[PDB]
């Protein structure tokens, strides 16, 4: 598994005259999206399963290294839609044959992190919009190649950050847009999720994800908690942008201890040291001076959390557990949290995002992390069919994912703040913020 490390992870040209800034880009309408999947493991098959019941979608091709996973996807589509997609398996470049033969309008890429950028760039160069699982890529050069390829091909490239479509995340966006918590000051983002048992897995994510902990000390998974907070703050879209980040890491102990406790002495995780600090902590500074706490711990034994805290001069909203407080909320007693299902009912009633009210009920029926997956996929289909911009542009996906190489650089440089590259080349200033859709 190719993993850029050291300077190649975070090392570095103006936009070509024939390239287009892709902020707010509207693609031609697709009344029936001819969609292909590249990588149908756990995540890829989940997207496939939900999209075979969506209107205006035709799944034309399915590609995976494993023949039986391709067949599982093909059989699922045939059962639900009455038409079989073409299946491709074998080598890691077999997806190129699918792109050439099917010429899909769009592809959903749910492979491991190492191949996200290459597969998405090839897809766009073959005339397909690229929807890519998190993180968008691993290195700064990979992120720039996705930006530059999108601008050169004028094809959508969107990282599929599903957390922005959670009910609480959508409600907080709605409350922030309405000015409920005043002027924004500070946000807190996290991915706290104990994944240490992946060390005992030889298939699925265990096959590739733990190895990243042996090569990179930094925030390997920064997007889930950050995505919502970045769009609360309108980062990269007119109002503000990521400016700098300083990163810090606790000792790297949990995974070394897990391997010694549960795995044989000759196992590779007992002979390859884990160097990624169990808890990664970073502080982002935006251009307007806001701070974002960003934390990653996918090792320690503790409850799941994404933090999802957004704080302003007139109140604070936070998740895990969902809680709100502010002068305009409830009885206005900001000294205590409004939390729990009973007290929050009036908050949901007043501030539920209209997108959640339109799709969230069916999304809770469909499922996928509580419904956010179905909302996210529905918005992708709606924007493609209506010729409307995506709720997340390529520069946002690149900026959120750049926390991985930038935190690693800061940690390698003793915790010094490092500058964010401007993937928009200054055009962030004229990029319209995400509105409250519908």
Ligand X SMILES: NC(=O)c1ccc[n+]([C@@H]2O[C@H](COP(=O)([O-])OP(=O)(O)OC[C@H]3O[C@@H](n4cnc5c(N)ncnc54)[C@H](O)[C@@H]3O)[C@@H](O)[C@H]2O)c1
Ligand Y SMILES: CC(=O)N[C@@H]1[C@@H](O)[C@@H](O)[C@@H](CO)O[C@@H]1O
Residue 369 engages ligand Y in binding (rule: CB under 6 A): yes
One residue of 22, 27, 51, 63 binding ligand X per CB under 6 A = 63
Task: List beta partners, residue 242.
Answer: 286
Q: Which does 281 bind (CB under 5 to 8 A by kind): ligand X, a copy of itself, ligand Y, none?
A: a copy of itself
Report which secondary-structure segment, H or E, holds 130: strand 129-132
C-beta of 369 vs 425, nearer to ligand Y: 369
Task: List beta partners, residue 338.
Answer: 324
Report which secondary-structure segment, H or E, holds 60: strand 57-63
Q: Supply the minimum distance, in Å, between the C-beta of residue 369 and ligand Y.
A: 5
Contact, 51 vs 380, CB < 8 A?
Answer: no
C-beta of 159 vs 283, nearer to a copy of itself: 283
Residues 90-149 that bind ligand X (CB under 6 A): 92, 95, 110-113, 115, 133-134
Residues 179-208 that bind a copy of itself (CB under 8 A): 183, 185-186, 194
Residues 160-179 that bind ligand X (CB under 6 A): 162
Q: Supply the minimum distance, in Å, between the C-beta of residue 213 and ligand Y.
A: 13
Distances (CA, A) of 423 to 48, 111, 219, 237: 31, 24, 20, 12
Residues 217-256 that bind ligand X (CB under 6 A): none
Nearest to 404 by CA among 190, 208, 142, 221: 221
One residue of 39, 73, 135, 326 binding a copy of itself per CB under 8 A = 326
User: Which one-letter DSSP state was computed for residue 305?
Assistant: B
Residue 204 engages ligand X in binding (rule: CB under 6 A): yes
Q: Provide the phi-psi class of 24: left if phi over 0, else alpha when psi is between -120 and 50, else beta.
A: left
Contact, 309 vs 187, CB < 8 A?
Answer: yes
Q: Which does 343 bind (CB under 5 to 8 A by kind): ligand X, a copy of itself, ligand Y, none?
A: none
CA-based angle 22:25:29, to the nearest 5? Answer: 140
Q: 34 is written with which tokens?
A: 């001819």
C-beta of 15 vs 193, nearer to ligand X: 193
Residues 183-212 that bind ligand Y (CB under 6 A): 193, 195, 205
Site map (CB under 8 A) of a copy of itself, residues 384-423, x = contact: ------------------------------xxxx------
Contact, 295 vs 190, CB < 8 A?
Answer: yes
Residue 224 engages ligand Y in binding (rule: CB under 6 A): yes
Residues 77-116 that bind a copy of itself (CB under 8 A): none
Residue 178 engages a copy of itself in binding (rule: CB under 8 A): no
Report which secondary-structure segment, H or E, holds 406: helix 403-412
Residues 354-383 that bind ligand X (CB under 6 A): 369
C-beta of 162 vs 281, nearer to a copy of itself: 281
CA-based angle 9:13:14, to the nearest 5? Answer: 135
Residues 272-301 that bind a copy of itself (CB under 8 A): 277-279, 281, 283, 285, 288-291, 293, 297, 300-301
Number of residues that bind ligand X (CB under 6 A): 25
Q: Is the dihedral of CA 418, 422, 426, 428 positive or negative?
A: negative
Contacts of residue 342, defined as CB under 8 A and 6 or more positions apart, other chains included, come to: none
User: Which one-letter DSSP state was computed for residue 205?
Assistant: G
Residue 438 engages a copy of itself in binding (rule: CB under 8 A): no
C-beta of 84 vs 305, nearer to ligand Y: 305
Q: Supply the minimum distance, in Å, between the C-beta of residue 56 and a copy of itself.
A: 39
Contacts of residue 380, defined as CB under 8 A and 6 or more positions apart, other chains included, come to: 131, 158, 160, 390
Nearest to 285 by CA among 341, 245, 332, 226: 245
Neighbour tally for 341: CB within 10 Å: 8
Which segments within 47-102 are labelled E, that is strand? 57-63, 86-88
Footprint on this chain of a copy of itself (rule: CB under 8 A)? 183, 185-186, 194, 244, 246, 248-251, 253-254, 257, 277-279, 281, 283, 285, 288-291, 293, 297, 300-304, 311-316, 325-327, 334-337, 414-417
Footprint on this chain of ligand X (rule: CB under 6 A)? 38-39, 41-44, 63-66, 69, 92, 95, 110-113, 115, 133-134, 162, 204-205, 207, 369
């Amino acid at each position: 598994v190719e993993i850029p490390a050291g300077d190649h992870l975070w090392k570095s040209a103006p936009r070509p005259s024939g390239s287009t800034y892709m902020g707010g880009f509207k693609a031609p309408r697709l009344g029936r999206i001819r969609l292909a999947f590249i990588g149908v493991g756990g995540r890829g098959f989940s997207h496939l399963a939900q999209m075979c019941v969506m209107d205006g979608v035709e799944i034309v091709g399915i590609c995976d290294l494993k023949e039986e996973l391709t067949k599982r996807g093909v059989d699922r589509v045939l059962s639900r839609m009455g038409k079989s997609p073409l299946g491709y398996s074998g080598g890691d470049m077999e997806y190129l044959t699918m792109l050439k033969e099917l010429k899909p309008d769009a592809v959903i890429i749910s492979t491991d992190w190492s191949s996200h950028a290459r597969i998405a760039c090839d897809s766009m160069k073959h005339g397909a919009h690229a929807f890519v699982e998190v993180p968008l890529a691993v290195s700064l050069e990979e992120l720039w190649s996705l930006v530059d390829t999108s601008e050169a091909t004028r094809k959508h490239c969107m990282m599929m950050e599903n957390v922005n479509y959670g009910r609480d995340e959508l409600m907080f966006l709605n409350m922030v847009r309405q000015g409920v918590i005043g002027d924004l000051l500070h946000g807190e983002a996290a991915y706290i999720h104990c994944l240490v048992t992946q060390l005992g897995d030889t298939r699925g994510e265990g096959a590739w994800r733990p190895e990243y902990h042996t090569r990179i000390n930094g925030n390997l998974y920064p997007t889930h908690g950050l995505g919502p907070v970045a769009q609360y703050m309108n980062l990269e879209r007119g109002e503000d942008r990521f400016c700098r980040v300083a990163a810090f890491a606790s000792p790297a102990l949990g995974r070394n201890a897990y391997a010694k406790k549960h795995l044989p002495a000759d196992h590779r995780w007992n002979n390859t040291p884990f160097i990624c600090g169990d808890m990664n902590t970073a502080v982002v500074k935006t251009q307007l001076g806001r701070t974002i706490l960003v934390q990653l711990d996918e090792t320690s034994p503790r409850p799941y959390s994404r933090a999802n805290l957004i704080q302003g001069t007139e109140g604070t909203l936070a998740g895990f557990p969902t809680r709100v407080a502010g002068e305009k909320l409830g009885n206005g007693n900001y000294h205590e949290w409004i939390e729990g299902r009973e007290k929050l009912a009036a908050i949901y009633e007043k501030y539920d995002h209209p997108l959640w009210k339109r799709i969230g009920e069916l999304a809770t029926k469909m499922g996928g992390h509580g419904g956010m997956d179905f909302v996210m996929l529905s918005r992708i289909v709606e924007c493609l069919r209506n010729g409307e911009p995506m709720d997340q542009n390529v520069y946002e996906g690149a900026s959120w994912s750049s926390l991985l190489p930038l935190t690693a650089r800061s940690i390698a440089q003793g915790g010094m703040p490092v500058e964010f590259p401007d993937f928009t080349r200054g055009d962030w200033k004229t990029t319209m913020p995400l509105a409250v859709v519908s």
